[PDB]
């Protein structure tokens with residue numbers, strides 16, 4: 001029993017974190033085999049924020065202008081290249097702690113664990129979601145750039161995020177591990193801001209299923225809804241449209257609980273229209289949207305990782 | 307910016323988790339140097355739940371009745387002893403991944419990270435608090451016994467919890483790493499239940515300070531209170547008494563924000579009497595009590611671990 005915002009065990013990622021310095025600028029890098037991946041703005045100074053020409057800044061650098069430190073060991077850089085908004089630094093030593101890994105680009109609504117790091121050293125781990133507006137509500141300070149987000153499947157670390165920017169509302173923007181930003185964001189100091197965000201409907205439904213699995217039914221009702229009528233209500237409350245693909249993805253949770261997906265949609269419709277009336281669900285007074293259907297199955301079934 | 311329920315990086319603990327089997331019973335153990343620590347009920351069957359005599363059950367076992375598996379390597383047990391509610395199994399191999407560590411017994415209101423494990427394999431990590439009633443609101447299923455809770459300081463893992471039991475309300479009971487239960491709980495199937503719980507006042511105040519550090523002041527007011535008058539209100543709302551020691555512990559957060567502790571108490575008094583009026587604090591519609599003053603300083607200052 002119980003239901004927590006649970007992150008993946010972080011050890012496999014901790015063994016990959018290093019510190020990268022170019023001049024007076026320092027941030028984190030990810031060391032896999034003989035390559036260190038880091039944000040390309042490591043080559044910027046405070047004077048290179050408004051419109052850096054990264055190609056022109058980088059051509060002026062040599063391999064020896066990059067210092068990479070793994071724990072208390074210096075790794076010599078023997079090559080470098082820029083890919084989108086990341087820099088790949090070839091080093092003289094393959095990381096002996098490299099896990100089985102992949103790079104993946106996630107869709108909005110998917111969750112991942114963040115290992116927040118400073119100066120190449122891990123500080124903490126937490127779970128979060130790619131918002132529909134392609135920001136993440138992270139917890140990051142100066143020097144966290146290059147911290148990564150990931151999921152683990154069996155024994156394989158799937159890296160999905162590398163941290164770059166904080167936006168004016170205090171939320172965060174970053175890239176996949178190939179250096180492509182999520183959303184419209186750029187690595188320059190422009191007036192860019194988070195767009196309007198929405199609530200991740202399929203995830204709210206997954207979490208209502210979690211609540212039923214854990215023994216709570218107070219919020220259910222005797223009604224059903226059509227998918228189209230539900231989405232008319234969802235739109236009014238700034239919820240993402242629920243697609244037939246989402247309904248299919250909720251199939252396993254529906255089967256385990258005996259509550260049809262559209263019946264759970266009718267429960268959610270009533271919670272949106274009426275509120276919770278002083279009650280809580282899984283310890284929250286708000287409808288939680290940072291658990292995916294897979295996250296619920298994983299945590300209610302005790303899945304482990306090799 | 308941002309503020310998340312952040313756990314410690316778990317790698318140092320992952321390297322210590324093993325599987326212990328006695329007969330058909332399996333659970334997790336913690337392997338440090340040449341000793342494996344696990345719950346003593348590994349020696350119980352389903353028929354030994356109502357009132358096991360652990361001394362009589364254990365004297366009937368030999369070292370070879372215990373199977374310890376680290377990954378896919380068997381560790382031979384060469385001695386055993388019972389200490390309180392834990393069993394210490396001496397094994398033929400010292401764990402080469404043993405971190406710097408301590409055992410500590412925590413006070414109610416202190417937080418820690420849990421590495422939930424099944425069959426010796428880590429599944430996830432989350433943060434939680436020792437409640438005033440000496441339960442934890444964990445997320446644990448059959449087979450999670452022997453999972454541990456911990457804090458990290460510099461390079462030292464301080465283990466503070468080992469999981470044993472689930473109570474009827476779905477909360478959890480366990481021991482320190484010397485095998486002494488927190489609270490009045492026992493490792494037998496009796497009618498024991500969680501006592502009435504209270505909210506951890508000093509932690510709510512710490513989290514209001516976190517909210518101010520991150521740029522939100524909506525809930526402040528122009529009033530102050532005496533400590534005694536605040537505690538009269540706290541008692542009515544089922545909050546723990548605030549002591550002068552707690553006021554002292556909040557000193558650093560008070561100094562950083564310029565808000566006197568008793569002024570923050572007057573803010574909290576008004577939030578208890580009036581509610582939030584549809585507003586949120588750090589993304590929550592409830593007053594959060596599972597961050598300590600140290601947790602706030604750690605997360606707002608970017609402390610890392612060696």
Ligand SMILES: *[C@@](O)(c1nc(-c2ccccc2)cs1)[C@H](C[C@@H]1CCNC1=O)NC(=O)[C@@H]1Cc2ccccc2CN1C(=O)[C@@H](NC(=O)C(F)(F)F)C(C)(C)C
Pocket residue numbers: 025026027041042044045046048049050140141142143144145146164165166167168172187188189190191192307
């Ligand atoms: C990340 O740790 C690091 N950034 C640097 C850096 C910054 C400027 C020049 C050279 C090197 C070294 S470490 C940091 C994390 C961020 C700070 C506060 N919380 C965070 O999550 N990232 C930045 O400071 C980025 C990097 C960057 C690249 C190119 C141009 C400008 C910047 C500044 N920056 C920002 O996040 C700024 N945000 C914006 O400009 C935005 F809103 F996105 F448009 C700001 C205003 C410094 C937070």
Ligand SMILES: *[C@@](O)(c1nc(-c2ccccc2)cs1)[C@H](C[C@@H]1CCNC1=O)NC(=O)[C@@H]1Cc2ccccc2CN1C(=O)[C@@H](NC(=O)C(F)(F)F)C(C)(C)C
Pocket residue numbers: 001331332333347348350351352354355356446447448449450451452470471472473474478493494495496497498
């Ligand atoms: C823990 O993973 C494991 N328990 C065993 C075990 C159980 C009985 C006999 C032999 C071995 C192997 S692994 C498990 C975790 C717990 C289950 C559900 N969620 C959880 O967190 N712990 C138990 O099942 C404990 C162990 C125990 C020891 C001695 C006597 C009885 C038990 C049963 N037990 C309980 O937690 C029970 N709870 C109570 O009896 C209580 F409410 F505390 F009084 C129950 C009813 C099985 C959950």
